[PDB]
Symmetry: C5
Subunit: 310 residues, 5 copies
């Protein structure tokens, strides 16, 4: 479903982290909705921890690929040969093994700045993925510009990306997107770091039993992969730089998932064991015409068929 | 046997992966059939897993060699000094130890793109080896453009090669060749990844007994190394880019091998042990490259068998 | 609190080791006190030993970051793209794991010389951190120019920094600052190498018991992080190169800390187990208008609230 | 003993693998016989397998050395600063640990091509060491151009060197020399890969007993290090590229060594051992004589005789 | 004590291996005797085997340092930025762990040639350290040009240095100095490879007992560090290239040390356990005006006070 009535006729779209969850979904959206645009996906491609990209997420991709590591000078230098009109920077490190603090900064921030430089020279608009992690454990709703107190390097690295584009808001049109607990197709290969809806839904379908921490009633703003996609494409029409929250702007408990899940998968065991996010989405709507569809229900509904692929 | 009535008189032919199975066979074909052409073979040469090229496969080669690693910038930069008219890209990674996903892509795809760039600048026609692996476990017959759902990185990497040349069909004349279970001389050093005909034929000749999975009646389109060669040389007359299936277009069971094998090696034990089906849709290849495979599993096993006797 | 009535309006301030103790504190001072100045922090960012920088020390930073390793030619080359007016070189190696002698010299001295070269070309004033370690075990008070007999590589490396700027006092305005046992907020992540006031105060607050070597009456010139900050900002108005001692110029025993500590945290155990520094601060005062506030008391007082964050 | 009546007065001679057996002997020959020529020896210098070069082989060398690895771009780039008139490429890998196939090709062939390129640009004549290994187990006599079927990478790599210069016979004057079982002074440090005459003569002198495979009557064309030297110096007057066999052109059994050896060292034990397993080499030397004026002296006898005094250095 | 009545007023002196024994002593000589000259010391600085340089040997150095590895292209390339008038090449590998043959050649010879190239371009006179090791076990006296049959790589590498400068005697003024068993202050950190006078004198002062091989009456030409220094400074006035022996030209047995030692430290045990060098110094005297003072006696005498620093 087109999110902008632009043909993107002779445009070249570069998606880094294209073998990953959002990157691959995004690449497919353009493939199906703007068949005239050139979609080129770039990715390191699963190093095994570290990069959890996977060719399985690109199974029906008819565009082109670039096997590259954004930290590799040679690869970046070669990337300058490519003429692209847009850059959707989705490539980053898996929080799973985010051990070393210096390395998370290298690939999540340092590498980013370099892509910014290349995009600016090519006067290609930039749309990048930030994170709701920039807020750390602060009071919800989470508003951009307020209480961004990361609790881990990964969250901090993302904050640095934003603090940078904000400081350089006129170097080029650069739009940061802070995602909040995204779920949907193609997140399976993120392994243990795949969404809880994917986690729960799978435990239910498998062991017919599902584990969940202390009452699992903690609230997270779950945004469906489709709305995240809408955000990226809407963002490419931005005539000014900025960083926006991108969630459904409605928090839901892990229990409500289990619930909406039972309402589909029937009943299952709810074994326990012994933070609050909600996207303030106003400016996003205001600036990007963003308008999320898919609440946890519409989301879990649309996603569930794929989850059945067992 | 000439597959094109061209002399290839002052042409320089570059064959990457020339120390490997098809590359070495190909190099010899040109050597014997187009003696006027300059055949230059390039290869990393067996690193031990990884590259399974082997000088034994070039024992009677009178042309020239280039010891190089296609992933090595210095080697590639040095390769630009060479003026070649054709590039047969056969160099790739052994599915045997295809462990790391990032590395398969580096050498099978990234390295490929760079060769593409060099060939284009030198305006040298490109003929490269793809794989039937791009189809994964989909319904046979396998048609280019349909149901290409790789199941492993190796298959995917090959698909990326094709998806690229198709997107750049006018940058230069680039012809991809999707091989299906190739067998024939010089595949011995591929070790455990050598064709089943070579595997079975050897077990029979040795232990007089042969193992084989669940009834071994699964069908594979076995194409003899000679037809693969025909495909490459026919492909060098292509005036347009494209990717083609290259098999015999006739599936055969592992049992039919055992059969055609007993019909030669006499009888032997058929021990078993406890979901794919390939068959090349070859129409476009015929149509575009004048490809016409000879050698059915019988003619193939027949012609191959004498060499297999070298024990 | 402004330490100079300069607006620093369109100035760019580069702080290396900005993710560390003094660097992060310094970056915040400029942020809060000279909001018009551009504060750019650079750091390797904790490699795990080695670099003990930590994003936690930059939690409220609104300026920009540079993920870089001063020993990396590529990073340094990229750094030349940045136009900065001042360089506060705080980046150095953690004495904790200062094992290899060659490596301490590389990052503490060799890397320093290169920054000197870059700053000189950019005609940017240089203010760097030296150490009271240059004096080794010599008679106190410790006077710059006298009895600088390092006892370890780290101390020596710092000495080389000074012996160099002194030899090149006219290449650019380069000011070295020899710190003496600094304490205060944001030194927690220095782990085992964090100040004794932080060490003792934590043992007291936790185990209600505190260990301390042979009578712990050995004297150290403890200087509060705030005075160190005063020193750096005062130093940026220097019109001539030089190296200065920066302490409170008043030695205090580890017992006096325990004392001033009990006077706050109540009583606690003083278990034992079986060098003398005092900054000669005259020239510093004379040349930089340096005037330390915060004695061990005012220091421990102001610091203690933060230490309570447990 | 001069092998050419040329003074080589202001010539610079570059010998790669100069810390090795033939390279070091060669460097000494020029030192003693053409004292006006500049002899510069280049070598990696024993990495420990791999490179078995050793400073002991250059003990009386008054010329100059270049510590370099021919596979190292930086070293090769620095080598271009040197102006040399001749290049004697003796540097190669020890068959002893020739494990990895890719690596033998890198240093024995790839590295060679680059030296060829540098020599060509400097218009310096090239004389390189090939091997009788290019023939593998084929019928003797071994003739250049016929039955070159290597059995190992090392032999293949050498063949590639030749197939290349032959394809590029006019790029510069490049002369390949296929050595057959060379023996003589300065091969001791090749360890286990030192000639059988050195091996046997040492076992005899030590344990007074000598081991030897299946009857040890298999024939090898043993060429004395001195004739190899004659070949290189004669080769530097070649006005055309080419690859030549360089042996004595007369095969001898390992027993004849033991024999010529007893005739000197007195008697000793001759213990055998068993474990198709056949090879037979004999250099067809005609073209070499024809083109290089090569004329080998030293039969196994004259060879073992002249060599034996040095072997006594125990 | 000045060894040349030249002021060396605006000269820049580069000493490699400056953190080592002779290099550090040399650097101090110029510091004290030619205060007008710029003394810059370069060293890798103890990697732990390998490089046994140590900052302790530069404790009172007021000149400048360069942390560099002569085998590192980047460091050598950076070194070209420095304008120096003289190069005293003292840096080399410790015979102690001289295991790999290829590596000794790399740093002792290959790295040397590169320094030769840089010095030649800068038209800076070169004075380098060779060794009496070039003679191996040949008949004494040891004459330059005769019987140089090294027995180890280290000795050979040194020989190559000389055979090179001799072949290139007109490329620049390059003077090689073949030292013979040098002893004196600042050799302590050479550990087990420190002079026998230092070894014996320490065993005597400590365990009051001293070990010594087969009768310890083997003769070595022991030259005091001060005469070695005289040789280097006299060498910098050479107007022609050449390689010279630099010893006292008088062999002495290890027993004579024990003797001259007892004559000072009183008596001690002489426990045993089960080559001959003598520098032919004529050409050195003739060409460099070299005239050694300090026989084993004057040497042991002058050195002994320092050895007392225990
Ligand atoms: N819950 C969420 O999914 C969520 C929340 C907040 C922010 N984000 C951000 O959205 C973006 C995409 O996340 P995702 O869900 O797709 O994760 P993902 O791991 O599925 O996709 C990211 C891709 O980056 C690739 N990559 C990693 N290192 C690379 C390198 N050095 N060079 C090239 N490619 C490299 C990985 O292989 C992977 O394919 C990120 O920037 C991520 O931090 C996601
Ligand atoms: N059954 C088959 O034979 C079959 C089936 C499908 C596809 N293919 C394709 O055919 C082509 C060749 O197959 P093959 O049977 O010759 O396999 P092979 O193992 O012989 O590979 C050919 C050569 O590639 C060389 N090589 C690998 N990496 C290299 C590198 N980085 N640099 C230089 N050389 C390198 C190896 O040394 C080997 O000599 C490939 O593109 C392969 O994917 C073959
Ligand atoms: N804290 C004291 O009392 C004291 C005493 C004497 C001297 N000093 C000196 O003051 C300066 C700052 O000390 P600190 O208390 O901030 O120590 P710190 O270790 O907390 O901070 C130093 C920062 O430098 C960073 N760094 C290290 N190597 C780097 C590299 N290669 N590239 C980029 N960044 C790198 C570290 O990660 C850290 O963030 C140093 O030069 C230190 O030696 C401090
Ligand atoms: N019987 C024989 O001795 C025989 C027979 C046939 C061919 N050959 C050939 O003769 C030539 C010399 O043989 P050799 O007897 O001197 O053996 P050798 O062991 O002495 O090897 C010669 C030298 O090559 C040097 N070298 C190896 N790799 C190097 C590198 N990367 N860079 C620089 N130097 C390197 C070795 O260190 C050694 O000094 C070769 O080309 C060899 O293959 C010898
Ligand atoms: N001291 C003696 O008895 C004696 C005798 C004969 C020759 N020599 C020669 O005199 C010179 C100095 O000897 P020394 O007694 O001072 O030994 P030393 O080890 O004290 O001095 C050598 C210096 O070279 C430095 N160095 C080593 N490798 C380096 C590298 N890669 N880059 C930069 N610096 C490096 C070491 O750190 C050390 O500081 C040498 O050339 C040595 O071989 C000394």
């Amino acid at each position: 479903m087109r999110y902008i009535d632009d043909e993107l006729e002779n445009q070249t779209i570069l998606i880094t982290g294209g073998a990953g969850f959002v990157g691959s979904n995004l690449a497919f959206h353009f493939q199906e909705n703007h068949p005239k645009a050139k979609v080129v996906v770039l990715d390191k491609f699963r190093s095994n921890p570290s990069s959890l990209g996977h060719f399985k997420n690109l199974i029906g991709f008819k565009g082109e690929v670039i096997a590259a590591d954004i930290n590799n000078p040679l690869d970046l230098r070669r990337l300058e040969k490519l003429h692209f009109d847009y850059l959707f920077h989705q490539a980053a490190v898996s929080d799973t093994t985010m051990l070393n603090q210096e390395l998370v900064m290298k690939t999540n921030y340092q590498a980013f700045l370099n892509l910014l430089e290349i995009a600016r020279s090519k006067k290609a608009k930039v749309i990048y993925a930030s994170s709701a992690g920039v807020y750390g454990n602060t009071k919800a709703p989470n508003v951009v510009g307020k209480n961004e107190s990361p609790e881990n390097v990964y969250g901090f690295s993302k904050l640095c990306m934003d603090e940078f584009v904000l400081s350089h808001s006129n170097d080029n049109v650069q739009v940061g997107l802070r995602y909040f607990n995204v779920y949907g197709p193609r997140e399976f290969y993120k392994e243990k770091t795949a969404s809880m809806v994917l986690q729960l839904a799978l435990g239910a379908m498998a062991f017919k039993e599902v584990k969940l921490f202390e009452f699992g009633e903690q609230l997270r703003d779950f945004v469906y992969i489709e709305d995240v996609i809408q955000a990226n494409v809407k963002a490419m029409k931005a005539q000014k730089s900025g960083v926006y929250n991108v969630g459904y702007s409605q928090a839901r408990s892990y229990n409500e998932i289990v619930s909406i899940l039972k309402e589909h998968l029937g009943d299952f065991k709810v074994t326990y064991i012994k933070k609050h996010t909600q996207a303030h989405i106003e400016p996003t709507i205001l600036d990007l015409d963003y308008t999320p569809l898919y609440d946890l229900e519409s989301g879990i509904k649309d996603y569930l068929p794929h989850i059945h692929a067992i």
